[PDB]
């Protein structure tokens, strides 16, 4: 599923992401935009042989099991394939664990480089929430 901006905002709001650990909804939409272009089916391989999965590009090195990242953790306790579903629940539940782990949204390189310190409220402008 490729989400529309407001569609995704509403979905993330329903799943409890607005102001989760102090991050306004705009931050999450901005992150999803640059990580996945709002496509639940996005995958990208890393140089270390890990793979990033889904709308928030969660990394198999730490967070999910894809059966081919030897020595990796499965900290969200999910197959990485679950992160590619049209239903964002698994991605959102995993993201909450990541964002809680001490580094905040700095875990997402595209957030740090493209969202952090910008007007992120722009990303939810116009939406009925
Ligand atoms: Cl916002
Ligand atoms: Cl980047
Ligand atoms: Na959903």
């Amino acid at each position: 599923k490729v989400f529309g901006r407001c569609e995704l905002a509403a979905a993330m709001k329903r799943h409890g992401l607005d102001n989760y650990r102090g991050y306004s909804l705009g931050n999450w939409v901005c992150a999803a935009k640059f990580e996945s272009n709002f496509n639940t089916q996005a995958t990208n391989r890393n140089t270390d042989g890990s793979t990033d999965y889904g709308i928030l590009q969660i990394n198999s090195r730490w967070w999910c099991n894809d059966g081919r990242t030897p020595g990796s953790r499965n900290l969200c306790n999910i197959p990485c394939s679950a992160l590619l579903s049209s239903d964002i629940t698994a991605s959102v539940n995993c993201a909450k664990k990541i964002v809680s782990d001490g580094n905040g949204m700095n875990a997402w390189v595209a957030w740090r480089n493209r969202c952090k310190g910008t007007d992120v409220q722009a990303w939810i402008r116009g939406c009925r929430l």
Side-chain angles (χ1 to χ4, degrees):
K1 188 177 165 49
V2 178
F3 278 79
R5 179 179 61 90
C6 292
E7 189 188 10
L8 176 61
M12 284 174 158
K13 185 178 182 57
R14 192 182 93 85
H15 285 287
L17 271 188
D18 193 4
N19 297 122
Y20 192 85
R21 293 294 267 249
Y23 292 92
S24 68
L25 195 57
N27 284 278
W28 298 99
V29 170
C30 184
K33 176 55 174 172
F34 292 121
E35 284 291 349
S36 71
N37 206 29
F38 297 147
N39 180 9
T40 62
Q41 300 197 68
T43 62
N44 289 289
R45 184 80 63 80
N46 305 131
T47 44
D48 75 357
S50 63
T51 299
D52 309 314
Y53 293 87
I55 202 145
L56 286 168
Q57 288 296 99
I58 290 176
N59 188 347
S60 69
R61 176 60 60 200
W62 299 99
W63 301 110
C64 62
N65 176 58
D66 59 8
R68 65 158 196 192
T69 307
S72 66
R73 316 296 307 305
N74 179 12
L75 285 178
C76 296
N77 192 40
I78 45 161
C80 303
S81 61
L83 297 174
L84 302 181
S85 166
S86 56
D87 178 343
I88 65 168
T89 299
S91 281
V92 169
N93 292 346
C94 185
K96 289 171 166 179
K97 187 183 292 286
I98 300 170
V99 81
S100 296
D101 84 357
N103 297 138
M105 286 196 76
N106 295 114
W108 289 275
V109 175
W111 181 82
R112 189 163 46 67
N113 290 325
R114 305 193 66 186
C115 297
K116 182 174 188 177
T118 71
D119 179 9
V120 292
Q121 187 279 334
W123 285 99
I124 56 161
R125 191 163 283 134
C127 306
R128 204 182 294 86
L129 307 177

